[model samples]
Target chain A: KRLEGKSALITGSARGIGRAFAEAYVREGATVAIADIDIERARQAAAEIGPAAYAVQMDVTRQDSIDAAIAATVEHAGGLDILVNNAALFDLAPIVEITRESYEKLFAINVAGTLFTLQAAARQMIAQGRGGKIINMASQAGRRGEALVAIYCATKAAVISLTQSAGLDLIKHRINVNAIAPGVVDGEHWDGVDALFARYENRPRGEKKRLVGEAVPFGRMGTAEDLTGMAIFLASAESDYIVSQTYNVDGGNWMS
Target chain B: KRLEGKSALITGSARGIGRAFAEAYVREGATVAIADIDIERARQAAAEIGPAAYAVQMDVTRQDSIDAAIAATVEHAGGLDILVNNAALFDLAPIVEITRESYEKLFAINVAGTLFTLQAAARQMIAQGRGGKIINMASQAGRRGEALVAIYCATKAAVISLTQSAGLDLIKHRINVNAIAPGVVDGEHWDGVDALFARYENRPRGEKKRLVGEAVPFGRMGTAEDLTGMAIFLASAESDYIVSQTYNVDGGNWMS
Candidate 1:
């Protein structure tokens, strides 16, 4: 019950890290708005989390849908004390072959969408004259650019920058902004990543995953639950002074 | 001659890490603007360096002074290619007792000052249509808050954030943004720190210094010269794609 009586709005909560956050929040006695483009799945997740969780339809790339979803969450949850910008698309593409349309769309959902939700949430918090927490999902790719995933890396980097700017701009309003940059986590994404690495390096899928896991100093792939503690800390009063930083949950991958 | 034919503007270049950067740049065959608030000391430093070094009185807290100094450097050195935001102030005060004035002043010089100078320099670099380097002096203090020096710690955190934001904003324009965070460097401030720690802990000054030095994983206090290699790396094309990162040269004291 670390977040007892708090209310939160989380995008992409139907699966992956987003779902994990919603589940963790409810267990801590917090009310949650589980927003996702997959409306049925989102509702199922809400029902599984118990009476404290509610579901809404959200398409992060569209501003109108984002606004509606946020309004519904505030209406149902009493107030939004935490906002997690979690919906993002990931892929690998070389810079030379990345089309302008794909790049724009990538940034639209990953960078601009996060900003839109953050701006709306901060406005409400400012009007109420109460501080809140805003956490963005970034990655180690953002800290160190990768050759094949240049566009995705750039967007994550933008998320990190946006976190910093919003933190300073919102500090006077008493709101805190921070981010989490997780290493490769064990999920469906990791499965696809393993296949991709196997194809690229001419290795078996299992061997590729094993090699990649060993490359990480921690000697294993991170799980969705591995990030739960830091997320909770940032969303709580314990980290009030910790603003404008993106902590690498990557065991010892990039030492910055 | 790593930076041969380049020109650099180093803030607070009369002493400490700033002086180290100037000396390193000159040895690599680059012309340097030795800008410092202490005019007499800056001139003496420039004289000791060589003819390639120039001096200017620049107080980062004032935008006009910063702009004028950059202009003078461009006129004398031919053009600006690298800008190092190295001027900073540090003091310790308990978090609960920290005053608003101290906080504002710290941000004014360390955060806003870095932004203003980078903005002016970026405009020039953009107009020139050539890529340039911008390095900020950050600290490990920026990564964590402590019992004492809370305000100073916040300011450094802001600089780290500014580095991220400004880096992304200027990347398309080909301007690289990076920061160097040093730990326990042996400088003029060391004696005062030693005396203060001895008085507060009721211990001998030499013993206190020795104990503190040993606590660092490096087993010694870092010299100002220890930072030169990193400064050169960030200021050169060697780190063209390294952006929005703060490198901690803390002898493995703090790892990622």
Candidate 2:
């Protein structure tokens, strides 16, 4: 009940890590909006999650879509207290093989998506006259570059950068901006990641995924469950003073 | 039950934020040792907290005492999985009014105490071979210096520095070193603070405290309960990959 009487909007929350966050938020007594690009899936998840959750269609790449979704969420939940910028795209290519289309698409969805959504949410929070929290989804890949993951890595790095810039800018409005950097979470998305790594590294199926899990200090990959506690922490009043930080929840993968 | 089967030792756990951490740890299913300089008080608190809590006498300024307390706690709890370095002395004075005795006592108890206790606990954690976590108590005062709070502020700043340095040094052993910097927490310790500030700032009794609370972005002082969610998160597996960071738990007092 840490977030009792609050409302949250989590982008791409129909499934995967976003779903975990939505569930935790609801359990903590917050009304949640499962905002995703796929309205059908979003509605199904909301119904499955029970009365406190509602669904909204959000195409983060479009400002009008994000604005409407925020308004719809506020109308359904009474007010918005938190926003988790979890909508993102992932792709991997060697620097030499990277194409303009891939670069623009990833940047448009990941970087631009985060900025505009944050802007729209902050505006609503300011109008409500209550301080708010914004949690951006970053990755261990943001801390550095990988040979086959340059575009994806850059987009996450930009998320952290925007978190810092906006955290400073919005402090006057009583809004807190922070990010969570998860490392090697074994969610549904990892299947695609594993297949891409297999193709790039000439490894047998599942070999790359297994190797990555073994490489963590904890000796395994993280589940979506591992990320929920952190998501709840950032959304609740406990982190009101925490601004402009990208907290690591990777089981000891990144030291900073 | 996030901490089920884990054992924890928290210094100065007989009272204040340390006691709050001890109580929360027990509630989370971790067996906790309340290590304090006051044996009778430690015993009383432990008894009040129930069977999962035990008491051990510790003088943070003494290496032998710290060593004995760790050993005793390990013996009582079965093994040590977490250590919270919460023992410290607080004093305030204008820079010109600050004396050598005041400086050394604060440093000896607050700075050296944190270092040696951290060292002893890390040794035991390394021997256990299951990895561990160490949480140091810092303050918003640590982030910036105040005219009347120079000494106390410096000690906390050192805590952050030591947290960063130790985090890097201990990562090889998989021991996470992180600090929590709380802002203006209204605990037992604040009474003395309010008095000192009242005298120094020429304010009436309780005047400074009220003004400070109103100044926070959240519009109130923080309670110990406000900090427990973060304490639990840092001690659990959720923050296993987090290293070398000082998380702020103030009610929007400090931005970073």
Candidate 3:
């Protein structure tokens, strides 16, 4: 109900963090779009999310897809007021060994895709003449690097920089481009992390994760549920004065 | 070259950021202590750093050692003007499965090591009747929780919080407590960081490092040299208005 009457398009919402953001936005009273490259999954995700949710197929790597998807979102939802650019392509390979294929694919989907999506969303927001919110997804990995996560980390770092740069310019248009750098979002739900740690860290399954929870200052891992609160606040009018900043909701992992 | 005439003690100066700080301090004309548990290496590091640098043994986990180091620092340098809490123990285990042994060891040396060392240094700075600078080494990891880096992340978050708390009280004494949260300093030059990452990430020889270096937004890992400018700023009159702030020298890796 916090975002009552607003409309939001959260890319990658077919599942994971994107799904969580979509669910929360709807709960807060925004008409949301479960936008993803997989049209069937997006539609399913949107339908499952209940009333006021729409499905918009978008492949952020393609500007045409982004434009059409955003256009359709505005048409169906009445108007797009918030854009959560959460769709991302993440993979890890040791840097020196990273192949050109991996680098190009990662950059296209993560960095270039993020910027192009922003251009499309900001253009529409500008034409609408109402101030809008644009939130990007970054990661703690972006703040530093790991031996295994070369491209993913750099891409996220780029997003944060993009957020700051875009935010400064977009403010003149009354659009705020902010970001969230999440830590260990129970990516446990996804094998990409555990599998990577096992492959690279020589760690037993589950050991790295358990240790991470114990190490949080707040003494735990975070849930998508835990993070939605901040997402809601940032999208709401409460954070209007906040700009050009990336907030980390990391169980006190990082404190500004 | 900016901290002329200053007197300082930097913990863990046998290597890594501590040693880098020593080299930078000497070049800046600051009389500094190369303090570490490994006194021989500390002395070696000090010798390498040239005159104006003194080797002092300090086991920061022990209060007596902390006291003795601070005392020896003032006696050796005439007066202590700065303290950099750069000694820290970092390890990672996942959340639910962390052992008490690992947890306690990290906390004893990182969190309490930071706080008590600050207490000892702040007390002496006050007694000397001169306002002083206290610098702590937190990390970019402190800004967020990592699945594999729970304890290390928490300790850094504590360092940040402690810096803020101490800054509030220290301002009355004209003293400033600030923290540096670096991303990763390219460890190719330092055995300390290389060993740590090797153990943590299970990286094969050069793979982890090359990946980390390539992942930096600046297209390379940050150097020890890249970080000293901010340290000098914090240690000089230039940052007189800056207090209790944790600044990142991660080369646009994170922006707040």
Candidate 4:
């Protein structure tokens, strides 16, 4: 129960890595708000997670939605001690063929959304006169540019950069901002990713997935559970002194 | 007893962070060979650490010495399951005035030394046909350059780079190559560093130390103890799937 008295808000906590973190936080004795763009899914997740979790509607691309969700979280959970900026979109396209609309949409959700949500959380923590923890979901993709994932990679790189800047900026208020860069995680979202890879690489349905798993140093695909240990550590007081760093939890895909 | 039944060797384990890792490894039920350039200090440390530890003379700059030390460690401890490359030289100089001699000396011990020692360990581990863990001691200094510590910083940066290359190269053998980058640690080595800062920056005795401690986001310098948890993690089986990564243990300093 490392987070025995804490309250947390995880964006896109209805499923995938976000939900994994939400469930772990709840098990560790923290009240969590499951915020997602899909209201029905968020409601179902919160209900499944029991009394300690509640649903909130949020579209991270909009400042108004972010503000309302944070307000709702604070009102319901009492006060926010942790925020996991886990809401983001992912798509792959060759650099030459990239569209302005796709690039802007991704930046709006992954980069700008992380920044604004972090700002709102920092404001609340500062007002409460207590320090807080903020974790941004970066990716191994952020470590370098992928031929087919140019926009997505750039956005995650921005997330990592933002964590550093925000961490330094919020030091006076004791808000520890950090990030987690996952490797090749096999999650519900990866089905679509695999399909895209099939189209781009002329492969079958699961060929890319299988190849990536075999390529990892660990020779396996990362599960959402593989990330929860790090999530709990970042949200708990054990990591109070850890700031601005983005830890990679991808089975040795990119070592920094 | 996280390291039960494991046999390990730590270079420069006579004192400081290296010795701290040696002690913790012993406490966790691993037989640790205290390898050092100074045989007397190594003997003292091994004696002080009890039966689980023994002394071996090693000069990382000399390939023969590194080879001899590894052979001795394997002979005494049965087999080498872990290797901590904690031996290195540190110094500060204005970049314009950095003598080629000083540059070579630091690199001979820091960069080339790490590489050769790692090669020797990998060779032995591969011969044994069991995967091993190799941990290089990097520093927050490695992440970037400092005006007065150009040579030292560059050497560490090389260590980080080598970890990446070696990790990927040795994956087929299952040898995990990772590093730990410490931030503003209040180790015994810092006294000399502080004196250098006093000379270079025109500060009074202990002033540089005080200033650095104050500058950390955690409001204090890190203790050697602060780094042991990470050391244990990287050396143990729990981190079998993690590779080529350098995790920083600096009290919120240089967040990467």
Candidate 5:
């Protein structure tokens, strides 16, 4: 019951880390607001999580949409205590071919979207004077740059930097800002990554995936649940003093 | 000549990591300001480096003193492009026994002091609009809390958080913010840690140091020079996109 009686607003809650966060928060007795671009999927996820969870359509790339969704969430959940900026799109385009469109789109959703969410959430948190927790979804790519996914990496890096900057401004308001950078989780995304590498690097997909898994000192790929513990911790009172950091939930894949 | 013709300011430059940074920057043809609380020691250190190095008296804990030092550095070096927040004090004390005076003193020098220095540097950098690098000294203890040295850890953690927050605020102005958290460096202060731990855990000093070193995966303690490469990299334009992140040079002691 870590989040007992708390209210949470999670973006991109239709699937993946977002879904895991909603379920985890609910399990801890939290009332959750599920925001996603996919209305049907968002509704289904909200239904699965039970009546306490409310669904809203939120395309975070647009400031208006984000504001509307946040407003709706506050209205339904009473007030927002936890905000998980989990909605993001992942794409790997070679540096040479990464056009302005691709770059802007990636940054719009990953970087700008997180910023807008923080701006809105922080405003509400400050007005309420109750403090809050902001958990941005970052990735290992944020720490180190990748040749293929240069744009994606850069955007995630920006998210991480923004998390730090926001933490400073919000700390006086008693708000805690943190991020979770998860490694390659076991999911469709893992398979997609393998396929992309196989096409680009001229190697078998399975072999590439196996090589990556072996490279991790943790001896296996992480699950969404692997990140939930840290996400919940950051969103709970347990991490009151843990401000402006991005925890790498990569099982020692990226040694500091 | 990575820093060719640039002007750099490094605190605690009398010895240790600060000394290494001064040496490295000077080697790359940068004019250096060796600012330390120990004026005599700093003068001696600057003399060893060359005429390109200048020494200044600075007690980082005092904002007025720091402002005066920065002004003098700009006057001597012509301008400031790099600022390293490397001054710190480390002592091990249990949570229950740690005094409020010690806590304020630690934050005064480690956290708030770092902030004041950066704030001044940022004001200059933004005015110059050349976009500069600001590196703060952080530690593995800052990332994770330990049983002893809780206050010290808290201050370092604040430094880490501040680095992120300040970096974000400065990035739009093109000022890069980063940190280096070194593991237990093999230095003069090494014996002090062992002595304190011995008293705290009811063990012999030598055995305690050995046990602590053995726990690191790298099988040895780090040296101040071990962190030189990272300092140089972060301070250089090579890591331009890297902002609001702390790189640990702890020889695999605490892998993310």
Candidate 6:
């Protein structure tokens, strides 16, 4: 109930982490757009999330798609008050294992896509002449380099730094930007990650996940429900004083 | 020399981050006392450090031991200009398994000890009428809730809060207080943590360590050398503009 009447456009909402966000946002009384690259799955996710959720296909790599989705949110969902930049490409490989194609794909989708999406959203919010909230999806990897997850980590680190830099740019415009660095959350989102680590670390399919959960100081993977509270806080008025902070919701995986 | 002619007393310098700090301080041209509850181990650490390093026994849970350590540091090292509050119990326990005694013990040693040690250090600095640095060893756990190391998390949280509160209080006296939160560090200290996890998480001793290193977004756990930069920054004049902020030196573990 923290986001009553708030309209939020969440990118990559067709499934995985985005779906969790969409459900939680709706439950908190916010209208959400299940935006993603695939309109078909986006529509399905919207249907699953019930009536308050709308479906918009956003290919974040393209600016026109980003603009169209923003326009759709403003037109159908009413004023755009919140934006959660959750779309990104994640793949694991060591330095030598990756290619120029693989590297460009990550930066193009993660860094450029997130940046343009943020710019589009912030510009819209400013045009509305009202304060807004922009939450960027950073990662524990963004904070460091893991052997296999090197490029992904750099991209995430870029997200966090960009959040800090943009938090300043939009501060005067009343657009509060923040970043959330999620630890290992239990979801389909990590399925590919588990497999990748299994192959690289020479462990069983599920051993990587089990070992990671065990290594967490808290002893488990964080759930989406664990993330909802923070999402709500960031979107609500209570967090107006907090800007550009990358909070960890990984259940103590990166205990500083 | 980042801290030429300055004197520092680091609690729990018998091992771990405290020892890393002790070694770094001496190399940076500061006179450091390897302070811990065990004088013999402290002496050993001092010997390893060589030159201007001294050994003093300090049990932070007790005010008298803290007072005695401060006095000894001043008498031997000339005058205490820096304090590294690094004493804390590291172990893993779930909430249900934790007792009041165990919980209180963590708080008394980690929280109370840090606070009182800061107070003692500040008083001497205030008396000297010169500025000083106080570095508190917080953890990423302090920034969020975790599972197994719940008590330790709470203790680190308290340290961060105490650092902020004291930072404000000692501002007028020209005393700067800061906190450093380290992520999964690669060192012998982790052997104990690995054992704790081996018992609680039902994993082999060596497996726990290997798994944690693998889980780090950066291919491996941070080495002591990774921390030296921030440690030196906080202790040097370059960081004078910074106050009450916790910097994570986990090689990108916590980006913000």
Each candidate's number of clashing pairs is 0, 1, 24, 0, 0, 15
Q: Which has the greatest TM-score?
A: 4
Better of 2 and 5 by lDDT: 2
Chain A TM-score of each model, in the order shown? 0.95, 0.98, 0.95, 0.99, 0.96, 0.97
Model 5: residues with Cα > 4 Å off, grouped in runs: A1-256
lDDT of 6 by residue, B1-256 (tens): 7688989888998787788888988898999989889999888988889978888988999999999999998889778899999888876789889988888889999999999999999999999998899999888678777789888888988998887778767756778788888778777778788999899999877898897777554346667666665676677764553456576655334545
Which candidate number maximizes lDDT?
4
For residues B14-113, write the lDDT of model 3, one tens digit per residue. Answer: 8877888888888889999999999999999988888899999999999999999999988889888989999988676677868999889988888888
lDDT of each: 0.79, 0.88, 0.80, 0.89, 0.82, 0.82
lDDT of 2 by residue, A95-178 (tens): 999999999999998999999999999999999999898999999999889989999999999998998888877867888888
TM-score of each: 0.55, 0.77, 0.53, 0.86, 0.54, 0.55
True contacts kept of 3: 0.10
**DockQ of candidate model 5:** 0.03
Which residue window of length 10 is worst by lDDT in model 5 chain B? B247-256
Q: Give one digit per residue, the lDDT tens place, for model 2 in B1-256.
A: 8789999999999999899999999999999999999999999999999999999999999989989998997888777889999998888888899999999999999899999999999999999999899999988888899889889999999998998888878877888889888888787777888898888888898898889888765567888787888888888876776777788777556644
lDDT of 6 at A148: 90
Order the candidate numbers by TM-score, best to worst.
4, 2, 6, 1, 5, 3
Return the lDDT, model 2, position B156.
96
lDDT, residue B40, model 5: 97
Each prediction's RMSD over C-alphas, in Å, is: 10.8, 4.8, 17.7, 3.3, 20.7, 20.1
Report the TM-score of chain B alone for all candidates. Answer: 0.94, 0.98, 0.92, 0.98, 0.97, 0.96
Candidate 4 lDDT over A67-152, as tens digits, reads: 99989988898899999999999988897889999899999999999999999999999999889999999999899998899999
* Candidate 5 positional error at B188, Å: 0.9
Q: Model 5 clash pairs?
A: none
Per-residue alpha-carbon lDDT of candidate 1 for residues A32-140, written as tens digits (9 for 90 to 100) = 9999999999999999889999998999878689779878977997678899999998866432234446555766688667867887788777766778999999888
